[PDB]
Every structure is written in C-alpha cells, then in structure tokens.
Amino acid sequence: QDLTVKMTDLQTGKPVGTIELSQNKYGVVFIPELADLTPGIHGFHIHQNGSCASSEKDGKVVLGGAAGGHYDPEHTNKHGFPWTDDNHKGDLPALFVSANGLATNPVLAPRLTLKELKGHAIMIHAGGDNHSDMPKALGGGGARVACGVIQ
Amino acid sequence: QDLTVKMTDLQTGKPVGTIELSQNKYGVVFIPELADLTPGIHGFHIHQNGSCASSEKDGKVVLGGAAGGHYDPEHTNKHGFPWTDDNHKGDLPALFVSANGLATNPVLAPRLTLKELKGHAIMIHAGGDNHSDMPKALGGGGARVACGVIQ
Ligand SMILES: [Cu+2]
Ligand SMILES: [Cu+2]
Ligand SMILES: [Zn+2]
Ligand SMILES: [Zn+2]
C-alpha cells in the first residue's frame, strides 16, 4: 500500500470509493474499492492534468475534461496496452465491475512508478478498452464517469 | 504472439475458443478468444500437470483434476497475486467474461515465461479469485469449467 485516491462520480458528484496505489518490483498495483458503477468492463487510465473538473470543447461540456489527455510522458500520441511501450504510459488494464456495481479486482501497470503518478488524475470511463484507437479512439472508453486526483 | 492453446469446457466437452500466449519484456500476455462462459469474473491459473482429464477424490469425480494443483515451481504452497512471489507462480489475474459470455480481455503474468509454460495446463474456474486461500481456498475459484494443455 501507499497512496489512497478518492474517486468521485462526475455526473452525480458523489464519492464512489477509493483506489489504493502501491509500488512493487513489478510495477504499480491499483487496488479498487469502488461502488455504484455500471456492471461490465471499464476504460481505466492515468490522465495528464491533476484535476477532475469539467472542460469545454466547441460549446459542449466535457465532464472531467480538465484532466486532459492520457498520461503520455514519451509523447507517443497513441493508445495501447499496459505492456506495450509505444503508447501512453497511462494506459492501464481495464477495470472489472461486477453485477453488484462493485469494483474490487486489483490491476497492475508494469510501466509505471508511484512517484511519477503524483499530481495526475485517475480516470474511469463508461465504455471498455480494447487498447487501440480503432474502431474507436482511446480504446472506446467514451465519456468519463469517475475521476480522482493522485495526491 | 507465439502459442495457441485450445480450450474446452469440461462439463460439455465442447471447445470454447483459444487463448494466445505471447512473451514480452514484462512477462507473458494471455489473449483470450473464448465464448460460452458464464458472465462475471473467473479464476484463471496455470496448473502443474499437462492434462485436462478428470481425476478422482474420495469417490467423487473431479473435472479436470488430472491437471493437479496450481503451478508452484518454488513450492510456496500458497495462493496469491500475480505480482507477489511467495505464492504459486501459476496465479494469473482473473479472466473477465462479459454479459455475452465472451472472454476477450487480455491479461499479463509478470512472473512467468513462455518456455516454462510448455507441458502445463491452463485452467478457468467457475468462481472468481480474490488471490488468497481465505475465506475460500485457491481464491474461491471452485470447480474447473474450462481447460487446455499448453503445447
Ligand atoms: Cu482515460
Ligand atoms: Cu486453477
Ligand atoms: Zn491511452
Ligand atoms: Zn494459486
């Protein structure tokens, strides 16, 4: 264990739980303890800016848009797998949400370190993540439903 | 990519798809392409013996029991996480099965290598995997539903 990240639903504004971040010899483990999520597989990524506030795009509101794009320190400008290097370092494996709307399945990011995560935002999307920009950009994650700033 | 493992349902005996095994700098990636599985999270582990045949335990039939216990080359005799060392090296992250009964979400095992996998069995269980022997042994995976021998 190490860091505790408070997550909040963007649409409702109410807290949905926390995610514990820990560093180990194989990378960063994300241990979720969230509730009230839509059952299924969800896009899960680290974003650039440390904010969950809404942004604005061509006259339309973007929930959690202030977080910016996917954390991409090497400027790959591509969405990929958590085990591939030529893509966003913030690409995490998808988060599993069971029928009861709970997310407790831990996940690991081999290309990340805890230290570099400080000041960034953890994002959970409505759609899944096929780890590619096609047929849909950013793995088809779609809108941002839950978000939290890494302290 | 590298190896293709044919998976078959133990109860029905009919094929359920394949799992592609590939080696990369971070470990072994398991890319599933399975169908006809019960929606939800499933225990996913590498077992000792290279057989999916049934075994016998105190007069009761054990589907896929010929596969033996979880691959544990260091004899830890404990069930754990894919990123912890003091437990079965065959402990993989859980497999996600969507509502449509399909399993396509790729998963990685940082403690494994392709070469050592040859001759072992890939197992999918009915229950999930909380990566511990409690409250239920072997992460609560329960019975074995799908199995395949690594060539
Ligand atoms: Cu994202
Ligand atoms: Cu098993
Ligand atoms: Zn990305
Ligand atoms: Zn095990």
Coordinates of all heavy atoms in Angstrom, one line a residue, chain B residues 8-51:
Chain B
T8 N -11.3 -26.1 -23.8 CA -12.5 -26.9 -23.9 C -13.3 -26.9 -22.6 O -12.7 -27.0 -21.5 CB -12.2 -28.4 -24.3 OG1 -11.6 -28.4 -25.6 CG2 -13.5 -29.2 -24.4
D9 N -14.6 -26.8 -22.7 CA -15.5 -26.8 -21.5 C -15.4 -28.3 -20.9 O -15.6 -29.2 -21.7 CB -16.9 -26.5 -21.9 CG -17.8 -26.4 -20.7 OD1 -17.4 -26.8 -19.5 OD2 -19.0 -26.1 -20.8
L10 N -15.2 -28.4 -19.6 CA -15.1 -29.7 -19.0 C -16.4 -30.4 -18.9 O -16.4 -31.7 -19.0 CB -14.4 -29.6 -17.6 CG -13.0 -29.0 -17.6 CD1 -12.5 -28.9 -16.2 CD2 -12.0 -30.0 -18.4
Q11 N -17.5 -29.7 -18.6 CA -18.8 -30.3 -18.4 C -19.4 -30.8 -19.7 O -19.9 -31.9 -19.8 CB -19.7 -29.3 -17.7 CG -21.0 -29.9 -17.1 CD -22.0 -30.3 -18.1 OE1 -22.5 -29.6 -18.9 NE2 -22.3 -31.6 -18.1
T12 N -19.3 -29.9 -20.7 CA -19.9 -30.3 -22.1 C -18.9 -31.0 -22.9 O -19.3 -31.9 -23.7 CB -20.3 -29.0 -22.8 OG1 -19.1 -28.3 -23.3 CG2 -21.1 -28.1 -21.9
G13 N -17.6 -30.7 -22.8 CA -16.6 -31.4 -23.7 C -16.4 -30.7 -25.0 O -15.6 -31.1 -25.8
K14 N -17.2 -29.6 -25.2 CA -17.1 -28.9 -26.5 C -16.1 -27.7 -26.4 O -15.9 -27.1 -25.3 CB -18.5 -28.3 -26.9 CG -19.6 -29.4 -26.9 CD -20.9 -28.9 -27.5 CE -21.5 -27.8 -26.7 NZ -22.8 -27.4 -27.2
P15 N -15.4 -27.4 -27.5 CA -14.4 -26.3 -27.5 C -15.0 -25.0 -27.2 O -16.2 -24.7 -27.5 CB -13.9 -26.4 -28.9 CG -14.0 -27.8 -29.3 CD -15.4 -28.1 -28.8
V16 N -14.3 -24.1 -26.5 CA -14.8 -22.8 -26.2 C -14.0 -21.6 -26.8 O -14.3 -20.5 -26.6 CB -14.9 -22.6 -24.6 CG1 -16.0 -23.4 -24.0 CG2 -13.6 -22.9 -24.0
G17 N -13.0 -22.0 -27.6 CA -12.2 -21.0 -28.2 C -10.7 -21.3 -27.9 O -10.3 -22.4 -27.7
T18 N -9.9 -20.2 -28.0 CA -8.5 -20.4 -27.8 C -7.9 -19.2 -27.0 O -8.6 -18.2 -26.8 CB -7.7 -20.3 -29.1 OG1 -7.8 -19.0 -29.7 CG2 -8.2 -21.4 -30.1
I19 N -6.7 -19.4 -26.5 CA -6.0 -18.3 -25.8 C -4.6 -18.2 -26.4 O -3.9 -19.3 -26.6 CB -5.9 -18.7 -24.3 CG1 -7.2 -18.7 -23.6 CG2 -5.0 -17.6 -23.6 CD1 -7.2 -19.2 -22.2
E20 N -4.2 -17.0 -26.8 CA -2.9 -16.8 -27.4 C -2.0 -16.4 -26.3 O -2.2 -15.5 -25.5 CB -3.0 -15.7 -28.5 CG -1.7 -15.4 -29.1 CD -1.9 -14.5 -30.4 OE1 -2.6 -15.0 -31.3 OE2 -1.5 -13.4 -30.4
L21 N -0.8 -17.1 -26.3 CA 0.2 -16.8 -25.3 C 1.4 -16.1 -26.0 O 1.9 -16.6 -27.0 CB 0.7 -18.1 -24.6 CG -0.1 -18.6 -23.4 CD1 -1.6 -18.8 -23.8 CD2 0.5 -19.9 -23.0
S22 N 1.8 -15.0 -25.5 CA 2.9 -14.3 -26.1 C 3.9 -13.8 -25.0 O 3.5 -13.4 -23.9 CB 2.5 -13.1 -26.9 OG 1.7 -12.2 -26.1
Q23 N 5.2 -13.7 -25.3 CA 6.2 -13.3 -24.4 C 6.6 -11.9 -24.7 O 6.9 -11.5 -25.9 CB 7.4 -14.2 -24.5 CG 8.7 -13.7 -23.9 CD 8.6 -13.9 -22.4 OE1 8.4 -13.0 -21.6 NE2 8.9 -15.1 -21.9
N24 N 6.7 -11.0 -23.7 CA 7.2 -9.6 -23.9 C 8.1 -9.3 -22.7 O 8.1 -10.0 -21.7 CB 6.0 -8.7 -24.1 CG 5.2 -8.5 -22.9 OD1 5.5 -7.7 -22.0 ND2 4.1 -9.2 -22.8
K25 N 8.8 -8.1 -22.8 CA 9.7 -7.7 -21.8 C 9.1 -7.6 -20.4 O 9.8 -7.7 -19.4 CB 10.2 -6.3 -22.1 CG 9.2 -5.2 -22.0 CD 9.7 -3.9 -22.6 CE 10.8 -3.3 -21.9 NZ 11.1 -1.9 -22.3
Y26 N 7.8 -7.6 -20.3 CA 7.1 -7.5 -19.0 C 6.5 -8.8 -18.5 O 6.0 -8.9 -17.3 CB 6.0 -6.4 -19.0 CG 6.5 -5.1 -19.4 CD1 6.2 -4.5 -20.6 CD2 7.4 -4.3 -18.5 CE1 6.6 -3.2 -21.0 CE2 7.9 -3.1 -18.9 CZ 7.5 -2.5 -20.1 OH 7.9 -1.3 -20.5
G27 N 6.6 -9.9 -19.3 CA 6.1 -11.2 -18.9 C 5.3 -11.9 -20.0 O 5.6 -11.7 -21.2
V28 N 4.4 -12.7 -19.6 CA 3.6 -13.5 -20.5 C 2.1 -12.9 -20.6 O 1.4 -12.8 -19.6 CB 3.4 -15.0 -20.1 CG1 2.4 -15.6 -21.1 CG2 4.8 -15.6 -20.2
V29 N 1.7 -12.5 -21.8 CA 0.4 -12.0 -22.0 C -0.5 -13.1 -22.5 O -0.2 -13.9 -23.4 CB 0.4 -10.9 -23.1 CG1 -1.0 -10.4 -23.4 CG2 1.2 -9.7 -22.6
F30 N -1.7 -13.2 -21.9 CA -2.7 -14.1 -22.2 C -3.8 -13.4 -23.0 O -4.5 -12.6 -22.3 CB -3.3 -14.8 -21.0 CG -2.3 -15.7 -20.3 CD1 -1.3 -15.1 -19.4 CD2 -2.3 -17.1 -20.4 CE1 -0.3 -15.9 -18.8 CE2 -1.3 -17.9 -19.8 CZ -0.4 -17.3 -19.0
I31 N -4.0 -13.7 -24.2 CA -5.0 -13.0 -25.0 C -6.1 -14.0 -25.3 O -5.9 -14.9 -26.1 CB -4.4 -12.5 -26.4 CG1 -3.2 -11.7 -26.1 CG2 -5.5 -11.5 -27.0 CD1 -2.4 -11.2 -27.3
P32 N -7.2 -13.9 -24.6 CA -8.3 -14.9 -24.8 C -9.3 -14.5 -25.9 O -9.5 -13.4 -26.3 CB -9.0 -14.8 -23.4 CG -8.9 -13.4 -23.1 CD -7.5 -13.0 -23.5
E33 N -9.9 -15.6 -26.5 CA -10.8 -15.5 -27.6 C -11.7 -16.7 -27.2 O -11.7 -17.7 -27.9 CB -10.2 -15.7 -28.9 CG -9.4 -14.5 -29.4 CD -10.3 -13.2 -29.4 OE1 -11.4 -13.3 -30.0 OE2 -9.9 -12.2 -28.8
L34 N -12.5 -16.6 -26.2 CA -13.4 -17.7 -25.7 C -14.8 -17.2 -25.8 O -15.1 -16.0 -25.8 CB -13.0 -18.1 -24.3 CG -11.5 -18.5 -24.1 CD1 -11.3 -18.7 -22.6 CD2 -11.2 -19.7 -24.9
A35 N -15.7 -18.2 -25.8 CA -17.2 -17.9 -25.8 C -17.9 -19.0 -24.9 O -17.2 -19.9 -24.4 CB -17.7 -18.0 -27.2
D36 N -19.2 -18.8 -24.7 CA -20.0 -19.7 -23.9 C -19.6 -19.9 -22.4 O -19.7 -20.9 -21.8 CB -20.0 -21.1 -24.5 CG -20.5 -21.1 -26.0 OD1 -21.4 -20.3 -26.2 OD2 -19.9 -21.8 -26.8
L37 N -19.1 -18.8 -21.8 CA -18.7 -18.8 -20.4 C -19.7 -18.0 -19.6 O -20.4 -17.1 -20.2 CB -17.3 -18.2 -20.3 CG -16.1 -18.9 -21.0 CD1 -14.8 -18.1 -20.8 CD2 -16.0 -20.3 -20.5
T38 N -19.8 -18.3 -18.3 CA -20.8 -17.6 -17.5 C -20.3 -16.2 -17.2 O -19.1 -16.0 -16.8 CB -21.0 -18.3 -16.2 OG1 -19.8 -18.1 -15.3 CG2 -21.2 -19.8 -16.4
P39 N -21.1 -15.1 -17.5 CA -20.7 -13.7 -17.3 C -20.1 -13.5 -15.9 O -20.7 -14.0 -14.9 CB -22.0 -13.0 -17.6 CG -22.6 -13.8 -18.6 CD -22.4 -15.2 -18.1
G40 N -19.1 -12.7 -15.8 CA -18.5 -12.4 -14.5 C -17.0 -12.5 -14.5 O -16.4 -12.6 -15.5
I41 N -16.4 -12.6 -13.3 CA -15.0 -12.8 -13.1 C -14.7 -14.2 -12.8 O -15.3 -14.9 -11.9 CB -14.5 -11.9 -11.9 CG1 -13.1 -11.5 -12.0 CG2 -14.8 -12.5 -10.6 CD1 -12.7 -10.6 -13.2
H42 N -13.7 -14.8 -13.4 CA -13.3 -16.2 -13.3 C -11.8 -16.5 -12.9 O -10.9 -15.9 -13.4 CB -13.6 -17.0 -14.6 CG -15.0 -17.1 -14.9 ND1 -15.8 -18.2 -14.5 CD2 -15.9 -16.3 -15.6 CE1 -17.0 -18.0 -14.9 NE2 -17.1 -16.8 -15.6
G43 N -11.7 -17.4 -11.9 CA -10.3 -17.8 -11.5 C -9.6 -18.3 -12.8 O -10.2 -19.1 -13.5
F44 N -8.4 -17.9 -12.9 CA -7.6 -18.2 -14.1 C -6.2 -18.5 -13.6 O -5.4 -17.7 -13.1 CB -7.6 -16.9 -15.0 CG -7.0 -17.2 -16.4 CD1 -7.3 -18.4 -17.1 CD2 -6.3 -16.2 -17.0 CE1 -6.8 -18.5 -18.4 CE2 -5.9 -16.3 -18.4 CZ -6.2 -17.5 -19.0
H45 N -5.8 -19.8 -13.7 CA -4.4 -20.2 -13.3 C -3.8 -21.3 -14.1 O -4.4 -22.0 -14.9 CB -4.4 -20.7 -11.9 CG -5.5 -20.2 -11.0 ND1 -6.7 -20.8 -10.7 CD2 -5.6 -19.0 -10.4 CE1 -7.5 -20.1 -9.9 NE2 -6.8 -18.9 -9.7
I46 N -2.4 -21.4 -14.0 CA -1.7 -22.4 -14.7 C -1.6 -23.5 -13.7 O -1.3 -23.3 -12.5 CB -0.2 -21.9 -15.1 CG1 -0.3 -20.7 -16.0 CG2 0.5 -23.1 -15.7 CD1 -1.1 -21.0 -17.3
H47 N -1.8 -24.7 -14.1 CA -1.8 -25.9 -13.2 C -0.5 -26.7 -13.6 O 0.0 -26.6 -14.6 CB -3.0 -26.7 -13.3 CG -4.2 -26.1 -12.6 ND1 -4.9 -26.8 -11.6 CD2 -4.8 -24.9 -12.7 CE1 -5.8 -26.1 -11.1 NE2 -5.8 -24.9 -11.7
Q48 N -0.1 -27.6 -12.6 CA 1.0 -28.4 -12.8 C 1.1 -29.4 -14.0 O 1.8 -29.1 -14.9 CB 1.2 -29.3 -11.5 CG 2.4 -30.2 -11.5 CD 3.7 -29.5 -11.5 OE1 4.0 -28.7 -12.3 NE2 4.5 -29.9 -10.5
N49 N 0.3 -30.4 -13.9 CA 0.2 -31.4 -15.0 C -0.3 -30.9 -16.3 O -1.2 -30.1 -16.3 CB -0.5 -32.7 -14.5 CG -0.2 -33.0 -13.0 OD1 0.8 -32.8 -12.5 ND2 -1.2 -33.7 -12.4
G50 N 0.1 -31.5 -17.4 CA -0.4 -31.2 -18.7 C -1.5 -32.1 -19.1 O -1.3 -32.9 -20.1
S51 N -2.6 -32.0 -18.4 CA -3.8 -32.8 -18.8 C -5.0 -32.2 -18.3 O -5.0 -31.5 -17.2 CB -3.6 -34.2 -18.1 OG -4.8 -34.9 -18.1

